[PDB]
Amino acid sequence: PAFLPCELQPHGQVDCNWLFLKSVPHFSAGAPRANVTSLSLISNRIHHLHDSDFVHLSNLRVLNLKWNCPPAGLSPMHFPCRMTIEPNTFLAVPTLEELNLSYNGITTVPALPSSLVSLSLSHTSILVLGPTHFTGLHALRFLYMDGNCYYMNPCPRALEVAPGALLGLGNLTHLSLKYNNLTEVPRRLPPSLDTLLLSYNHIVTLAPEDLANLTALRVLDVGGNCRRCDHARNPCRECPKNFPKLHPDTFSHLSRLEGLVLKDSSLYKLEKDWFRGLGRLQVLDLSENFLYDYITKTTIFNDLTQLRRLNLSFNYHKKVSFAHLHLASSFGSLVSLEKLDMHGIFFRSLTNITLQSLTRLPKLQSLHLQLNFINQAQLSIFGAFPSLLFVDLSDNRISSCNLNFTLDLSRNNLVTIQQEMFTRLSRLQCLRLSHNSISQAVNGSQFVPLTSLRVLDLSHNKLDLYHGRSFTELPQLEALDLSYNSQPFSMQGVGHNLSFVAQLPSLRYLSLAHNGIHSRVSQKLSSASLRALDFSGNSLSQMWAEGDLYLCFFKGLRNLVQLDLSENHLHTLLPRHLDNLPKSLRQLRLRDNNLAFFNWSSLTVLPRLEALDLAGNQLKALSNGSLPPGIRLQKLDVSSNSIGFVIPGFFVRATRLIELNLSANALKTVDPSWFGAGTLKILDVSANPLHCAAFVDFLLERQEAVPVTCGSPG
Amino acid sequence: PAFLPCELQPHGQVDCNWLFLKSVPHFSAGAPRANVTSLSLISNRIHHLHDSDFVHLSNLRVLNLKWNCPPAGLSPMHFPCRMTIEPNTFLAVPTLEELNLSYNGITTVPALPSSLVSLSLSHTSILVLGPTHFTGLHALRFLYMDGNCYYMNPCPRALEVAPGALLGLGNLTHLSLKYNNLTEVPRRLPPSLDTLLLSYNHIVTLAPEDLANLTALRVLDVGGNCRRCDHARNPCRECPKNFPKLHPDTFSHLSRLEGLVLKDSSLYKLEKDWFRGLGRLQVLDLSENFLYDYITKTTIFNDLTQLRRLNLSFNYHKKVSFAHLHLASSFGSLVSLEKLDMHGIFFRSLTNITLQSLTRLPKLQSLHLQLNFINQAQLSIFGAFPSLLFVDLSDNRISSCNLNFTLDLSRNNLVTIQQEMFTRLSRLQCLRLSHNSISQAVNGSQFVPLTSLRVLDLSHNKLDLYHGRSFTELPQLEALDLSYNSQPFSMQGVGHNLSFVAQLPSLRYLSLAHNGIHSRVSQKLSSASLRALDFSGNSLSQMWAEGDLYLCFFKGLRNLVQLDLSENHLHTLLPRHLDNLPKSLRQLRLRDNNLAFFNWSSLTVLPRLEALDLAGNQLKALSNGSLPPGIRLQKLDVSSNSIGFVIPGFFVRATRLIELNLSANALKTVDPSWFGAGTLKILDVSANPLHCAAFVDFLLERQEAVPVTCGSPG
């Protein structure tokens, strides 16, 4: 093991993260020190760097020293920490390209090699920058220095950057200076910049001289300099009235601009000239402003025709929600628009008029309308749009499947579904109706127009499933989530019909998780098409106490590949039950039951079983027969049990075993005799009271597989 | 330790339960064996009893051998077990009074001492009884023998009891013979019986000769002999039509009868003569019959005037729910009635007419109306009743506090509360509105008529709490449960006003548990009256990351005694936070957070703290200073952490410490040096990998306090 206590990985990277080290490990001389190209020392306890820490690292290109010595405000305990660096610490490494010194209490910029390409000094204690700090860094392309004077990392004044301090850096393209209490753009920046992030300072005034000779700018973030603290979740200083102040020419010379962020700048309107001169503008973030009235009447969206993404979120009135909301005619052009975000504006009624302008935009794929407090939604409207893939109407008060037409209505106040809500939505493939108030008796009459519907999420509701023909109007339905509808199912003395599963010809995924199903339920679940059933969070235990009434509950699911029986209060698991389970099963999850014993031999009953998960049960040991012969098991999880010992040879027969999780048990050793091993690719043996005086050799033979604390003896 | 492996307790009882013993521990000769009056050997592995097992137990009066050798059907694994008993096993104990042999595969009744007063042979393998089996048991007062021939413990035939087999038992008062596949009452029973339980057999016919000369009967259970399997949750054989058959004189000679159970006897009506002759009848269970039409028209409730409890539940029609439901006029008399249970009949409308008959009954305290599928409920009706203490309308579709007027509406489909629902309910003191669909903006206008309301449970709803005057119409409200309303609180970018707490002058208990409160919330909670706040299941962690905005969140709760911050994702807990917490605190719960460190000294900041709960966190050890001086802590729970060691003297200063829970950690010893001990009353050191070769002496000195497995070495 060449680099203890650190870990050798591919791409010449050495991981020393989270080892609570007090200094940089020099490593023994015999190591291949020239081979290391990357060294990560994240979140250690290193408060002092030395000339000799990285000197022998001959091909070091990436170095990460993040979170070693956080300033008092960023320290979880608020411990002050001052990181000292010897003069030639990094000069000693003339190959160094990527240096991250963020979340470290250093007070000035150290001497750096001229090879450095990227430097992060974010959340450090550096309050001053001059030209001398960046002498001869001709390769430096990225400079991060966010968060050096703000509420979480305070300074009595602000970050000071002298005029032309970075002007000598001719290769610099990326510059971030957020949360530094600035009151103006630092003067004379390198014209090479393409990204400039000055957000969350207090640059409350702006002219073209502030962005002077920065003609290569591609992205410009200036938001949060003039904030609306009514919407703030963190410390916030309100923007004075009669601010902010810009003037038309500010951005006119930025012809290469593609992204402009003006969020949280207390804007009641925009000024055309700002944009007239930005012909390349793709993404515009106007969120958290006061543009509620502006967007109803504005004509500025004409000749913003190259715009692709537009964020208008939280442009809400302080005290009210609007009755209606009509978008200006100018939104119709906007022919390049792909994503429109209008969440958090607050309007109660969504109609045909509301989104009239947007109806003909040929590329509009995403419309975000959540958190608007909408009571009434005319959903047929969405059938009119040519390119719509995602409509989010979640968190309102209305009353695979990435990359197909999806409508998210979750977190609304729907009580009954009527089929007339889905007029014009025959194209819809995925519908989320999660977290509603739906108490309807679903009887095959709710979703009739939704003929393309492939996914229906109805979790977190009160659906009463007594009719045998529930969801029968969706024979093309592939996935149905009926978890967290426990209120109907937990009714005592009331029956529950699950026969409808048999009536859904193309259903592949079903969830009945967390329903508390425990008695008076259908005796058999039948389906030829179902591949995965989540039956977690039920009381299969109590069902299997009721004689043999429920012995063949899953048997009728003929082609079932995955079954989840986690959290079913199972104190025991007979060969009986396993034998009457579909023989097609490749994955069986049994997490967090109450199993103190497990007949391993009876696994033979499931010849196809590749994945078994017994985590969180109460196994005291691995014994009572080994893993049986012929077993196809590639993944086994027995973590968080009380496993105190393992019978010799216990795993051996698992010829396929790839991943084994033994963590959080009561093991005092790890013996090879348990396996026959080399094959094994993941061996998790963490959180075990390991005694430390058989494994030291064995564990180091198979170190590539092992991703490991002693409990003994001090 | 006189009785290892068993445990000596008060009342001369020796606990040997759940020790997986293979035989009865004889104990060393030196023990005070004459002092033991009771021996419990529940759920051990004892399949063989011997003459010498209890011979030295000179004053044994109670013996429990339950669950030692369960029959195949009752065995969790379905292991057959046959329990052998030597002839004089119990004869060897002439003082024996109470013998429980239930859940043991014995095939005949053993020889028993004449001192025996109570005997249980339930769920054993005894299929025959004769007079010889009970020779000379003149004291025998109680005989249990339920469940010896039924689905969970099958026999090919039935239990056979010869005529007059128990007739020699002149002191016998209690007899249970349920689930034994009987087809008639066993003939000539002792006239001394006062309780006779024959339920769940198949006694489908009944005449007075079956209860011949049993004039001292006080309680008679004959239900489930003639069942309706449509409502059954377990194996069930339907009752043939033209059955059951009784005739008027069956019960006429039972003048001392107080309780009659006729549940699940497929009754479409009752026959007067059955009851005409039972002047003492207090409790009548008619549940699971077909009495839906009978109770609308019957006149039998006249001259059932001494009846106190009446169960009519699940008297429902197979395929339907009734539109209305009018109770017969005869219910009005019935002047002795205290409890009426009418759940599971299924009717959609509850009106003034429905319960008209009951309106004037002077003692009616409990009316159970849950699980009826009621859509419309005229709640003012209940204001008319003179003695009503509990009305349960839970699990319907409507659209301290034991011993005061309570209305449970939980598990209905209420979306908005209107004050006009509570007209006439000014007397109501407790209201459960849990698990509804309530999405209302509570603004001080919902509960106006409820002037006596002391308890309001509004958990599991979607209450939006934005108005500062929510619940302001209840200034007398003492307890408010607002847990599991996370949908409003988890809305991102939306504020949440908790100022209303300050506006409730007499509020003592508040629950905000499991709301996901994490940001944009009131900065301070103020209240002079609040004594306990449950703030579990929130994100106080994220709130306390947002600078010092939330440093004084609980401070304004001036007289707060109990605070629950369990499950708040707390990775750390500064002296800061503790210091800005009410100084009145006696209980602080922090279960199941992510705390890997704890500054114990900073407990000094809470001088009144008697109870601290740190269970389920991630403490690796008890160190970093001991419990600080002056600490008033009487209960400390650090179970289910990863505590590997304890600094010496760690507890010492906790002069008051009464209860300490150390279970489920990584301890290898238990040292006295941790304490200074004698005071300590509960010391839980279970589920710890204890090494076993300092504690053996110490733990036995303080054995009275300790209620303990080795993990080492085999």
Added chain:
DNA sequence: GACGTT
């Protein structure tokens, strides 16, 4: 110094 997966 310590703390902690930010």
Added chain:
DNA sequence: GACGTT
């Protein structure tokens, strides 16, 4: 025999 808090 074993299993498990029924």
